[PDB]
Design a protein around this motif. Structure first.
Motif, short mmCIF file in Angstrom:
data_model
loop_
_atom_site.label_atom_id
_atom_site.label_comp_id
_atom_site.label_asym_id
_atom_site.label_seq_id
_atom_site.Cartn_x
_atom_site.Cartn_y
_atom_site.Cartn_z
N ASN A 144 0.86 -1.18 0.00
CA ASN A 144 0.00 0.00 0.00
C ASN A 144 0.90 1.23 0.00
OD1 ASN A 144 -1.00 2.04 2.48
ND2 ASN A 144 -2.46 1.64 0.82
N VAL A 145 0.90 2.00 -1.08
CA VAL A 145 1.85 3.07 -1.28
C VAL A 145 1.13 4.40 -1.45
CG1 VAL A 145 1.90 2.74 -3.80
CG2 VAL A 145 3.86 3.80 -2.64
N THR A 146 1.74 5.50 -0.97
CA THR A 146 1.11 6.79 -1.21
C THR A 146 1.24 7.11 -2.73
OG1 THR A 146 3.03 8.22 -0.64
CG2 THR A 146 1.43 7.70 1.10
N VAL A 147 0.22 7.77 -3.21
CA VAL A 147 0.33 8.38 -4.56
C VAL A 147 1.47 9.36 -4.58
CG1 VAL A 147 -0.73 9.82 -6.31
CG2 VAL A 147 -2.06 7.98 -5.24
N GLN A 148 1.71 10.11 -3.48
CA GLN A 148 2.85 11.00 -3.37
C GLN A 148 4.16 10.34 -3.68
OE1 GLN A 148 4.95 14.30 -0.42
NE2 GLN A 148 3.22 13.10 0.40
N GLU A 149 4.45 9.16 -3.12
CA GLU A 149 5.69 8.46 -3.36
C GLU A 149 5.90 8.17 -4.87
OE1 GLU A 149 6.63 5.15 -0.80
OE2 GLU A 149 7.84 4.14 -2.34
N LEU A 150 4.81 7.75 -5.51
CA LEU A 150 4.89 7.43 -6.94
C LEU A 150 4.98 8.69 -7.79
CD1 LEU A 150 2.10 4.71 -7.13
CD2 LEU A 150 4.57 4.40 -6.72
N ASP A 151 4.24 9.72 -7.46
CA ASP A 151 4.23 10.96 -8.24
C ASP A 151 5.53 11.71 -8.13
OD1 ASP A 151 2.94 12.78 -9.94
OD2 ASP A 151 1.93 13.84 -8.30
N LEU A 152 6.16 11.75 -6.94
CA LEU A 152 7.48 12.38 -6.82
C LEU A 152 8.48 11.70 -7.74
CD1 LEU A 152 7.60 12.91 -2.94
CD2 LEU A 152 7.54 14.71 -4.72
#
Ligand code: ZN
Length: 228
Positions: A144-152
């Motif tokens: 379960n990953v933040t969208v933030q982690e992927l978008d950065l």
């Protein structure tokens, strides 16, 4: 949630907007640590990590800001992992001197680590033509990953490869762009790459204050870039 003809043009960006976007996605400072915990709250819907920084030139503490009590209650007093961009300029008035703020970025630690690092496939089109993107460009060890982690991670590559947030004089050719975090289940999160009021660097990353998380299992990212 967004169609291509509704994408905001880069030319609409006012003042310091492009400079702020480039800083927050390419010259940022990130908290990336595992197995932390706090139930210290400053006010509002926040978690305060006292003494989080041991060698930062200004900050000592990290304040995580969330949209609501239900969101902060998911994480308060639990073992969490952090992955988000922080800065003093992201704090609301009256946050303590030498405190830095991040919007969201938190995931429960327990039972969240993948045995194999997940490389998130990216489909990228530039003016309709697919371009190859290295498979290691966006990766996560989280189920379960933040969208933030992927978008950065995705936007850092867009700056490096396409000069996304450069001025037109500094070879920034892309004028419109959309990123979609395409999950197996769940309507996909999508962001207009030029959709924010970039001239306000304090709220640029407020889109991440919901601490939206998605399942990385079998997901991929779609990026649509246009030069007009
Ligand atoms: Zn897709």
């Amino acid at each position: 949630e967004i169609n291509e003809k509704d994408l905001r043009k880069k030319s609409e960006l006012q003042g310091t907007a492009l400079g702020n976007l480039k800083q927050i996605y390419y010259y940022n400072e990130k908290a990336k640590t595992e197995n932390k915990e706090s139930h210290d709250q400053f006010r509002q819907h926040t978690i305060l990590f006292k003494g989080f920084f041991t060698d930062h030139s200004w900050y000592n503490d990290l304040l995580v800001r969330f949209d609501s009590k239900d969101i902060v209650d998911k994480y308060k007093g639990k073992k969490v992992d952090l992955y988000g961009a922080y800065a003093g300029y992201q704090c609301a008035g009256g946050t303590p001197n030498k405190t830095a703020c991040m919007y969201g970025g938190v995931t429960l630690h327990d039972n969240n680590r993948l045995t194999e690092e997940k490389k998130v496939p990216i489909n990228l089109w530039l003016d309709g033509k697919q371009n190859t993107v290295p498979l290691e460009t966006v990766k996560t060890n989280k189920k379960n990953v933040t969208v933030q982690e992927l978008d950065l991670q995705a936007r850092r590559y867009l700056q490096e490869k396409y000069n996304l947030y450069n001025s037109d004089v500094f070879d920034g050719k892309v004028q419109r762009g959309l990123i979609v975090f395409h999950t197996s289940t769940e309507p996909s999160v999508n962001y207009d790459l030029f959709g924010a009021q970039g001239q306000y660097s304090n709220t640029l990353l407020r889109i991440y204050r919901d601490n939206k998380t998605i399942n990385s299992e079998n997901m991929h990212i779609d990026i649509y870039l246009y030069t007009s």
